[PDB]
Amino acid sequence: KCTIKNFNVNKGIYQTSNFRVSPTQEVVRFPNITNRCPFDKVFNATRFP
Amino acid sequence: NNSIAIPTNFSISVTTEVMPVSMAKTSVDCTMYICGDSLECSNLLLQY
Ligand SMILES: *[C@@H]1O[C@H](CO)[C@@H](O)[C@H](O)[C@H]1NC(C)=O
């Protein structure tokens, strides 16, 4: 009914779109790098050129 | 104006003729082609 956009359906066969399955989980995978690069040195340096 | 040609013998010939009748039936889906598995794209597709 949602595919044909109507409440009354005639007798026959019809192809239907996807309205059944929906995701419910989140999977995040990042590399395990722990070192913190300095934004206190490239930004707050001694003297910019 | 006074000569004719009348055949004295014959032959039986079998010839082949090929004719197409039908082709493949194709069904498409607007979902999982235009947007795929993406709810944000599917939300904007409801107006079409
Ligand atoms: C930069 O560092 C100096 C000392 O390390 C500090 O006095 C200054 O406030 C810093 N600049 C900023 C914008 O935080």
Automatic annotation (TrEMBL), chain B:
Disulfide-linked positions: C35-C41
Glycosylation site list: N1
Protein name from the UniProt record: Spike protein S2
